[PDB]
Amino acid sequence: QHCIQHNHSSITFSLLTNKSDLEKCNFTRLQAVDRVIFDLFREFHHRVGDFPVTSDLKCSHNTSYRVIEYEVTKESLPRLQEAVSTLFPDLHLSEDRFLQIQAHDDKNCT
Amino acid sequence: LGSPCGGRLNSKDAGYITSPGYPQDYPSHQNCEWIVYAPEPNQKIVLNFNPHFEIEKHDCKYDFIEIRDGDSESADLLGKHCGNIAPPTIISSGSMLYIRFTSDYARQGAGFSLRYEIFK
Numbered sequence A: 001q002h003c004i005q006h007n008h009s010s011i012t013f014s015l016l017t018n019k020s021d022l023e024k025c026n027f028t029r030l031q032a033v034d035r036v037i038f039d040l041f042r043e044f045h046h047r048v049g050d051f052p053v054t055s056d057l058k059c060s061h062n063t064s065y066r067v068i069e070y071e072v073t074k075e076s077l078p079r080l081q082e083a084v085s086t087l088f089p090d091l092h093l094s095e096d097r098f099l100q101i102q103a104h105d106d107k108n109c110t
Numbered sequence B: 001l002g003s004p005c006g007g008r009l010n011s012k013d014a015g016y017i018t019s020p021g022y023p024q025d026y027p028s029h030q031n032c033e034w035i036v037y038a039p040e041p042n043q044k045i046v047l048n049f050n051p052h053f054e055i056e057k058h059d060c061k062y063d064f065i066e067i068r069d070g071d072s073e074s075a076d077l078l079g080k081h082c083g084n085i086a087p088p089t090i091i092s093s094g095s096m097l098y099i100r101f102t103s104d105y106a107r108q109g110a111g112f113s114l115r116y117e118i119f120k
């Protein structure tokens, strides 16, 4: 639903409830393996501003399953919500969930 | 005396143990070890953390503080804490307490601070 369209590819923003098994983001590795998700990430993250160190932020480091995932907590929520609001007006986060950025190489925003 | 952090402390005078730079952000790649002991073998040690407590949480796999009941690192684990909420009062069972702070390469926070003394 909440998504942005590019050239036969789309980046969807979703809210999930269950804890993922993803490990911490390694930004140098995440940059080298897939730069598209990384520059997207840093465009988003600068809008996010201050992200609490004591909220998890995990990465796929995969090209078939390209996901960046924030953790929405008491402290995480205000900065994450202010950022997502800039792009999407129907995405309102809530505590104890995870906002996950997946990249799809050939599916589109429809 | 090269060590940047840690050491053996005598608890007859109450003191404090803090992450390097607390309340400012602790360094990366830290590996501090403390041993606090009671002067005489009957006494026991009690720790109390300050409410300000900021250690990177990831099921405490990267940055964490751990407390065990004895001298070695192999002593029974009393707690391994990270995240936003300071741990409750810890009371030693014997007369030696082992404390260790570990930092990884990436992200840091304010860290921890506690105060050690003899119980009662």
Ligand SMILES: *[C@@H]1O[C@H](CO)[C@@H](O)[C@H](O)[C@H]1NC(C)=O
Binding pocket: A026, A028, A029, A030, A032, B105
């Ligand atoms: C992060 O990824 C790089 C590869 O780009 C690797 O060399 C490095 O060891 C990784 N860091 C950790 C802490 O695993």
Ligand SMILES: [Ca+2]
Binding pocket: B056, B062, B063, B103, B104, B105, B106, B107, B108
């Ligand atoms: Ca860390």
